[PDB]
Enzyme design. Structure first.
Site, PDB file in Angstrom:
ATOM      1  N   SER A 129     104.156  30.794  -9.064  1.00  0.00           N
ATOM      2  CA  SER A 129     104.515  32.208  -9.166  1.00  0.00           C
ATOM      3  C   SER A 129     105.984  32.508  -8.913  1.00  0.00           C
ATOM      4  CB  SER A 129     103.662  33.067  -8.239  1.00  0.00           C
ATOM      5  OG  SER A 129     103.814  32.647  -6.905  1.00  0.00           O
ATOM      6  N   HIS A 170      97.005  33.797 -11.197  1.00  0.00           N
ATOM      7  CA  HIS A 170      98.089  34.328 -12.028  1.00  0.00           C
ATOM      8  C   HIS A 170      97.874  34.112 -13.516  1.00  0.00           C
ATOM      9  CE1 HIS A 170     100.876  35.922  -9.096  1.00  0.00           C
ATOM     10  NE2 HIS A 170     100.537  34.923  -8.302  1.00  0.00           N
ATOM     11  N   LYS A 213      94.965  40.958  -8.955  1.00  0.00           N
ATOM     12  CA  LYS A 213      95.978  40.893  -9.975  1.00  0.00           C
ATOM     13  C   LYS A 213      95.293  41.428 -11.244  1.00  0.00           C
ATOM     14  CE  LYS A 213      98.236  37.656  -6.936  1.00  0.00           C
ATOM     15  NZ  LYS A 213      98.112  36.297  -6.298  1.00  0.00           N
TER      16      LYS A 213
HETATM   17  C1  LIG Z   1      97.523  36.352  -5.091  1.00  0.00           C
HETATM   18  C2  LIG Z   1      97.204  34.991  -4.506  1.00  0.00           C
HETATM   19  C3  LIG Z   1      96.479  34.890  -3.309  1.00  0.00           C
HETATM   20  C4  LIG Z   1      96.029  36.093  -2.549  1.00  0.00           C
HETATM   21  O1  LIG Z   1      95.041  36.964  -3.131  1.00  0.00           O
HETATM   22  P1  LIG Z   1      94.737  38.360  -2.394  1.00  0.00           P
HETATM   23  O2  LIG Z   1      93.504  38.703  -3.163  1.00  0.00           O
HETATM   24  O3  LIG Z   1      95.886  39.243  -2.652  1.00  0.00           O
HETATM   25  O4  LIG Z   1      94.440  38.063  -0.988  1.00  0.00           O
HETATM   26  C5  LIG Z   1      96.165  33.646  -2.770  1.00  0.00           C
HETATM   27  N1  LIG Z   1      96.559  32.491  -3.413  1.00  0.00           N
HETATM   28  C6  LIG Z   1      97.258  32.565  -4.595  1.00  0.00           C
HETATM   29  C7  LIG Z   1      97.700  31.304  -5.282  1.00  0.00           C
HETATM   30  C8  LIG Z   1      97.591  33.798  -5.137  1.00  0.00           C
HETATM   31  O5  LIG Z   1      98.218  33.814  -6.196  1.00  0.00           O
END
Ligand SMILES: *Cc1c(COP(=O)(O)O)cnc(C)c1O
Ligand SMILES: *Cc1c(COP(=O)(O)O)cnc(C)c1O
Lengths: 398, 398
Positions: free
Chosen positions: B185, B213, B244
Site C-alpha cells: 500500500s 487493497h 475499503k
Molecule cells: C486496511 C488493512 C488492515 C486493517 O483493516 P481495518 O478493517 O481498517 O481494521 C489490516 N491489514 C491490511 C493489509 C490492510 O490493508
C-alpha cells in the site's frame, strides 16, 4: 499435519458436547426480533434474558433516528484511519459526549471494547514496567498484557490483601498499572474498588478500571462502580464499550491525564484500523447523551434485577451473589447435565438465558446467567420467575 | 514520572512537526460530505483522493437502503458475543456472501480487519511454529505475530529469493504460515504472489494472503491479486476488510480448509467481542453482493487510476511505480518540507491526498499518496492533474 491439527482436540470435545445436548448454545440464531426483550428463536416467542442490552437503547427512537440520518447524510462507512485519512466530525462529537458523560478532559474512541483494552494496556505499560490484574480478569485485559512487553502480576481473585502484598513486593521505581473491573461478570458480584484503589495509590500505581458492565446505572452520574464507591477523581483511566448499555459497537478510554492525547500517537490498535461508520457513531453519541439522564430506565433495570434475584433466591435456587449487586443474576447448578437440561427446558418454554460451563467457567461451576434489561416489564420478570420454577422443579434443581 | 512519561518524546516531536507546517495532516476533519469524491474541508469544496473507498460503495442507494432497513427492523446493536450470546441471522448471511464472493467453503467475520489479522495469525501459528512475512508487512500482521507465541521470520521486502532462502533454513517438521499482501500500500506496487506461493509450497508452508487493497477489482471475480495471478485453489487463507471496497467496518478470513470452523472455537479476538451491528452487516452484505458484478465501477476505477498515473508521470513527477499496478498512485518528493508544501498547496487548492512521511515511511521517503475511487469522473481526474501541475510548479517539484 498442518496449522489446524492443533484444533483436533477442540473439534472432538465440541462434538462430544453437542452430542450430549439438544440446542447448541454456541450457535443461537435469532429469527425475528421485536424489542429489547422479545425475539423468535427456534420458532418460539422468547423472552431475552441473555443479552447485555442493559439500558434497552437499541430500539430507542432517537437512537434509531440518529443512525438512519447519519447513513443518509454521511454514507455507510469512513475515509480510513482517523489519523492517516481524516474523519467525519461525528468522531470528535462522540469523544466530546464521553468527556461530558464521565466529566473528563480526555476521551479516545476505539473500534471495539476489546481493542480499547488491547490497545490501552499494551501501550501504557512498556518493557520493565508492570501490569497488575485480578487472576480472573476479562480475556481482553489478558490479551492487552500479551500484546505488550510489560511484566504481568496476577493477584488472587477479589483479594485486596493479595493485591497489596503483590504490589508491595515489586521494585519501587518502575511505573505500574493496576487494572480492575467494577463488575465481575461471571457471577455478577462487584469489586471492592474503594479498598483496592487505596492499595494501588499506597504503592504509587496508576489505576485503570473497566466499567463495561455498569454504564448508565452505577453512581450518581451512571459512570460506574468507581463512581458509586466515591472514587471520582482518583481513577487514572476508565475503559468501556459501546456494546452493552450504549447499544452499538465500539470501545473507549477516558482520563484526566494531561498527556492522554499522546496515546493516539503510540497506540497501534487505534492508528491501524478504520474509523467507525457514521451510523454507529451517531447511535453511540445519541445514546450516551440520553444515558446521562435516563433515570427511569435505570430505575426499571434495578427494580427488575432485584425482583429476579430475590425471587429466584426465595424459590431455593443457588445464586452467585447473596444480594443483588449488578444487572447479572447467576444461577448455579450442580453439574454439566443439569445445567444443560435446565437451560434447554427454559429455552423450550420461551426464555433465553446464558449458559456458562467449563472451560468458560472454572471446573465445577455451571451457570445460567440472566442479564436484565431496563425494558423488561414487571410482568415479564414474574413470567421469568414462573418459568424458572417450572423448569427447576421438572429437572430437579429445586 | 508515570506511565505516560514514555510518550514525552513523541509529544515533543509531534509539536515540532506541527510548528513547521500549517494544516495538521493527522487531524483532518471533514465538515460536510456530498459524495464518494467531494467534501468540504476547511471551508473549501475539496476533491477526495486520500480515502480507501475504492468502489464508491458508501453512497450506493441499495447499500444505504439496506442499512436503514436493518436499523428499523433489528435496532442499533447486538446481543453480545455471537458464540456466547447468540446473533442475528444477518451474520450468517454476510459469511455466506463472503463464501459466494470468494468461492470458498469457509468464512469467518470479525469486528475489524485489524482484528481479523490479529486473531487469525495468533491463532493459527503456535509455540514452535513459524510465521514468515515480508519485512514491510502491515502493522496488524506484525501485531498478530506479537499476540501469538510462534517464531517470526522476516524476509527482505519483495524478495522471492530471500523468502525461499529463509524458509529453506527453518526446521522441516513444524508447521509454517507464510503471510503475504497482494498490494503493497505504501507505493501501490504488487507482490509477486505466483512466485512466492510456489516457494511457500516447495517448503510445505501454508499461505495467508491479505487482499484488503484489491477487493472487487483484481481477478476475474474481483477476489484479489492472488486470483489475478492464477492462484485460485492454492491459497489456504485470504484475509480482508470491509473498510475499503465494501464500505463499512469489519474484517474476515475465508478458506477451503475442512477444519476452518475450529478457528471460531480458539480465536480469542473472535470470541471476546460483540458482533457487528445490524446496519453494518446489512450494508456489508448488500455491498459484497453488488461487488460480484460491479464491472462498470471496476472499469472506471482502473481508467481513472491509469489516467492519473500516466498523467503525473508525463508531467515529470516521480512515482512509486513505473506502471499503474493498483488504485494507489504514490508521488515521491525530495524532502519533508517539499512534501508538506506540496500537500498544503493541493489542500488549499481543493484536493485532499494522503501525505506519508517518516517514521510512517522509511527515512528518506516522502510521499503524496492518491487513492482512486470508481466514482471519480474523467473530468475530476483532469482537474486533479491540473492541480498537481500547478502546485508542483509553484513549490518547485516539477
Ligand atoms: C486496511 C488493512 C488492515 C486493517 O483493516 P481495518 O478493517 O481498517 O481494521 C489490516 N491489514 C491490511 C493489509 C490492510 O490493508
Ligand atoms: C464487554 C467487555 C469487553 C469487550 O467489549 P466489546 O466492545 O464487545 O469488544 C472487554 N472487556 C470487558 C471487561 C468487557 O466487559
Amino acid at each position: 499435519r498442518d496449522l489446524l491439527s492443533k484444533f483436533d482436540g477442540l473439534i472432538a470435545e465440541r462434538q462430544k458436547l453437542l452430542d450430549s445436548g439438544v440446542t447448541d448454545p454456541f450457535a443461537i440464531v435469532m429469527e425475528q426480533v421485536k424489542s429489547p426483550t422479545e425475539a423468535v428463536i427456534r420458532g418460539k416467542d422468547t423472552i431475552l434474558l441473555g443479552t447485555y442490552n442493559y439500558m434497552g437503547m437499541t430500539f430507542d427512537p432517537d437512537v434509531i433516528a440518529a443512525g438512519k440520518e447519519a447513513l443518509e447524510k454521511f454514507g455507510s462507512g469512513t475515509w480510513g484511519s482517523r489519523m492517516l485519512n481524516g474523519t467525519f466530525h461525528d468522531h470528535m462529537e462522540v469523544e466530546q459526549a464521553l468527556r461530558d458523560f464521565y466529566g473528563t478532559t480526555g476521551a479516545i474512541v476505539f473500534s471495539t471494547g476489546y481493542m480499547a483494552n488491547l490497545g490501552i494496556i499494551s501501550t501504557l505499560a512498556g518493557k520493565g514496567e508492570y501490569v497488575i490484574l485480578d487472576a480472573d480478569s476479562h480475556a481482553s485485559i489478558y490479551d492487552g498484557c500479551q500484546q505488550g512487553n510489560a511484566e504481568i502480576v496476577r493477584f488472587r481473585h477479589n483479594s485486596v490483601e493479595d493485591l497489596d502484598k503483590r504490589l508491595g513486593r515489586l521494585p519501587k521505581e518502575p511505573a505500574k498499572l493496576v487494572v480492575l473491573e467494577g463488575v465481575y461478570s461471571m457471577l455478577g458480584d462487584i469489586a471492592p474498588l474503594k479498598e483496592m484503589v487505596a492499595v494501588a495509590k499506597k504503592h504509587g500505581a496508576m489505576v485503570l478500571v473497566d466499567e463495561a458492565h455498569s454504564m448508565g446505572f452505577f453512581g450518581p452520574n451512571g459512570r460506574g462502580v468507581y463512581e458509586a464507591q466515591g472514587l471520582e477523581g482518583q481513577i487514572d483511566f476508565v475503559v468501556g464499550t459501546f456494546s452493552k448499555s450504549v447499544g452499538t459497537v465500539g470501545g473507549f478510554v477516558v482520563s484526566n491525564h494531561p498527556k492522554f492525547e499522546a496515546v493516539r500517537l503510540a497506540c497501534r490498535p487505534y492508528i491501524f484500523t478504520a474509523s467507525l461508520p457514521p451510523s454507529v457513531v451517531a447511535t453511540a453519541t445519541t445514546s450516551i447523551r440520553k444515558l446521562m439522564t435516563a433515570h427511569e430506565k435505570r430505575e426499571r433495570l434495578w427494580s427488575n434485577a432485584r425482583a429476579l434475584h430475590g425471587g429466584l433466591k426465595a424459590m431455593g435456587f443457588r445464586l452467585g451473589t447473596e444480594t443483588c449487586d449488578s444487572a447479572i443474576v447467576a444461577v448455579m447448578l450442580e453439574d454439566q447435565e443439569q445445567a444443560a437440561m435446565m437451560w434447554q427446558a427454559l429455552l423450550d418454554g420461551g426464555l433465553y438465558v446464558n449458559m456458562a460451563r467449563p472451560p468458560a467457567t472454572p471446573a465445577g461451576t455451571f451457570l445460567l446467567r440472566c442479564s436484565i434489561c431496563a425494558e423488561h416489564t414487571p410482568a415479564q420478570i414474574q413470567t421469568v420467575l414462573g418459568m424458572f420454577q417450572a423448569a427447576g422443579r421438572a429437572v430437579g434443581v429445586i
